[PDB]
Amino acid sequence: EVRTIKVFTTVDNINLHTQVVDMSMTYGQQFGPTYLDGADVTKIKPHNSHEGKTFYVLPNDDTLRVEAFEYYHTTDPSFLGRYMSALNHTKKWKYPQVNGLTSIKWADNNSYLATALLTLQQIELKFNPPALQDAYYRARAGEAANFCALILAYCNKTVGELGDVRETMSYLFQHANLDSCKRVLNVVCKTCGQQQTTLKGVEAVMYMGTLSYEQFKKGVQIPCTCGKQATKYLVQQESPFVMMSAPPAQYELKHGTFTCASEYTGNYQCGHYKHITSKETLYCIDGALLTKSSEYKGPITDVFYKENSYTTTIK
Ligand SMILES: Cc1ccc(N2CCN(C)CC2)cc1C(=O)NC1(c2ccnc3ccccc23)CC1
Ligand SMILES: [Zn+2]
Ligand SMILES: [Zn+2]
Numbered sequence: 130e131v132r133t134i135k136v137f138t139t140v141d142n143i144n145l146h147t148q149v150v151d152m153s154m155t156y157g158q159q160f161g162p163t164y165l166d167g168a169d170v171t172k173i174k175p176h177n178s179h180e181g182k183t184f185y186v187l188p189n190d191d192t193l194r195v196e197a198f199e200y201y202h203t204t205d206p207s208f209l210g211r212y213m214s215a216l217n218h219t220k221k222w223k224y225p226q227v228n229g230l231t232s233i234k235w236a237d238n239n240s241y242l243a244t245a246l247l248t249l250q251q252i253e254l255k256f257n258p259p260a261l262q263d264a265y266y267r268a269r270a271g272e273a274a275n276f277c278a279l280i281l282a283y284c285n286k287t288v289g290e291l292g293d294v295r296e297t298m299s300y301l302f303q304h305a306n307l308d309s310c311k312r313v314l315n316v317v318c319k320t321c322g323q324q325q326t327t328l329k330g331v332e333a334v335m336y337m338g339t340l341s342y343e344q345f346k347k348g349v350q351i352p353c354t355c356g357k358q359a360t361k362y363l364v365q366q367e368s369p370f371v372m373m374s375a376p377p378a379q380y381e382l383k384h385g386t387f388t389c390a391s392e393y394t395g396n397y398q399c400g401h402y403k404h405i406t407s408k409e410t411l412y413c414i415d416g417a418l419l420t421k422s423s424e425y426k427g428p429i430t431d432v433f434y435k436e437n438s439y440t441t442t443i444k
């Protein structure tokens with residue numbers, strides 16, 4: 130008087146939980162919201178082909194809420210749905226190899242994700258949420274759909290929003306292991322004197338104000354609360370890279386003095402991005418398009434550099 134089939138539910142595709150489903154009911158009445166391979170199967174009953182398949186569900190109990198925090202570092206119950214929604218788009222994007230890197234063919238306002246994807250393939254980063262690191266790896270190999278969909282979900286951005294590459298990175302670094310990154314800087318006032326300031330994690334590897342990492346060790350002008358103009362410089366830096374950002378402006382990029390950079394053209398919040406990377410020569414990745422040049426002069430807003438351990442000589 131009731132027929133049933135075996136299926137496995139999961140919130141991380143890693144702890145599979147055996148269930149038996151009633152072929153006269155929908156996955157919705159039995160499980161709550163259900164996805165099979167991204168497809169919202171909530172309003173559908175079990176077709177017989179489903180035996181043995183794995184389905185994604187929302188974390189209804191407290192075990193799953195833990196199983197899900199461990200995989201994604203989220204408690205937000207909308208996460209699964211926002212992600213599954215982005216994945217419906219990103220599974221259709223193309224992800225070519227350009228210049229030995231995984232890019233994204235232009236689609237639905239995704240210039241800023243491609244510049245972000247390209248940059249992540251060129252700096253040293255371990256992400257803490259296993260969902261991020263698995264998609265990171267798989268994106269290195271060309272299967273970037275899940276990686277991009279997770280970025281959209283972590284950013285509470287959605288396909289078709291135009292993004293900001295610096296902020297996209299800052300959303301992601303919060304779940305990266307930068308716990309041994311250290312930045313010590315010294316700010317010096319003609320009046321007040323000198324104050325050392327020592328910051329760490331995400332704050333140790335990100336700066337907004339100047340693009341030149343060289344300028345940053347020499348000294349950069351910052352206003353002082355006490356009123357005069359002060360000078361801030363870098364005295365120590367342990368971290369494998371550094372992000373230097375500043376609002377778009379014409380800037381020259383010299384082969385071999387940097388890792389890669391975000392070129393942004395247009396106005397606040399409606400411009401386009403392209404990716405500049407320093408290899409044997411300068412390369413410009415625009416989604417599926419690439420160009421080469423000896424030198425580059427143009428509108429740059431982030432420049433990434435390599436570091437291991439720096440110490441100023443300024444006494
Ligand atoms: C492209 C884009 C999308 C979304 C968003 N916002 C920003 C605020 N945030 C709270 C929400 C998302 C911003 C940009 C954007 O233009 N960013 C850049 C920028 C930063 C700072 N000052 C700028 C000045 C002039 C021109 C560009 C500037 C990199 C180019
Ligand atoms: Zn789309
Ligand atoms: Zn765009």
Ligand SMILES: [Zn+2]
Binds near residue numbers: 202
């Ligand atoms: Zn986290």
Ligand SMILES: [Zn+2]
Binds near residue numbers: 357
């Ligand atoms: Zn002062």
